[PDB]
């Protein structure tokens, strides 16, 4: 159930020069590439080991495509300002996201959509041949892209190029991309008292934490934080509960994760 995803952002700064462009790429939960237009020598930079040995031809072609897209965004930002009758003084944001999902081993579904100032603008439909415009301004873009046969080009990338290279990355980095890392767990006691179940250093980010009581889920009184990055490629999460001081040994924490042979059960 692997996937490859790209995220691009352009932000305009009237007066302080031409817009800022940043793009990043992921395979599942692992970043592997970045590009920033404000760097001294702007170029595509690897962020995972399994793309570090692709050769200078590969990385020069990627760099040229990034610089082309930043120039394309600069024109689009000027066009959007005209569609919406906006002044030339304010700052505006344009975001773009695309990628492919794999299953039998081929394309499960593709993505390609855009946003302006935080709201939907235009998106490629799941048929990879028609568009969904969000307002009357985006209808101008749809008419231009239909006349340019542009949906044909995005479908060809998503069904061929996206799938081929995702398979290549998954093979060259299969020792880290296809080997899950199990969480390290422990329970802490904080004085009626508080029981906290920890899970640290796991990959991928998908995980489930559940407190119990003689086999009964305790969902009603469970504090739970959002999954957060550890900073080294792994993730953390904890779930807490409050308990009558004395019944601590009646409660159990349960962990479900890809890196465990079978689900875990913990006590304080």
């Amino acid at each position: 159930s692997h996937s490859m995803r790209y995220f691009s952002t352009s932000v305009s700064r009237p007066g302080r020069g031409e817009p800022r462009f940043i793009a990043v790429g992921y395979v599942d939960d692992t970043q592997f590439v970045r590009f920033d237009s404000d760097a001294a020598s702007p170029r595509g930079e690897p962020r995972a080991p399994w793309v570090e040995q692709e050769g200078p031809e590969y990385w020069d072609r990627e760099t040229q495509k990034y610089k082309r897209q930043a120039q394309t965004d600069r024109v689009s930002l000027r066009n959007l300002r005209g569609y919406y009758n906006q002044s030339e003084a304010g700052s505006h944001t344009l975001q773009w996201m695309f990628g492919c999902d794999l299953g039998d081993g081929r394309l499960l579904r593709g993505y390609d959509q855009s946003a302006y100032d935080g709201k939907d603008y235009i998106a490629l439909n799941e048929d990879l041949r028609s568009w969904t415009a969000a307002d009357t301004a985006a209808q101008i873009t749809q008419r231009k892209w239909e006349a340019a046969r542009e949906a044909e080009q995005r479908r060809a990338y998503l069904e061929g190029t996206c799938v081929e290279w995702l398979r290549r990355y998954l093979e060259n980095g299969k020792e880290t991309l296809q080997r899950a890392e199990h969480p390290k767990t422990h329970v802490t006691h904080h004085p009626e008292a508080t029981l906290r179940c920890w899970a640290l250093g796991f990959y991928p980010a998908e995980i489930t934490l559940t407190w119990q009581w003689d086999g009964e889920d305790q969902t009603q009184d469970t504090e739970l934080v959002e999954t957060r990055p550890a900073g080294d490629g792994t993730f953390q999460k904890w779930a807490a509960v409050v308990v009558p001081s004395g019944e601590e040994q009646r409660y159990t924490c349960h962990v479900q994760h890809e890196g465990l042979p079978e689900p875990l059960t913990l006590r304080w």
Binding site: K65, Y66, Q69, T72, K144, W145, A148, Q153, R154, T161
Partner: peptide
Amino acid sequence: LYNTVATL
């Protein structure tokens, strides 16, 4: 592998 497309 990145991809670059038309202007809006």
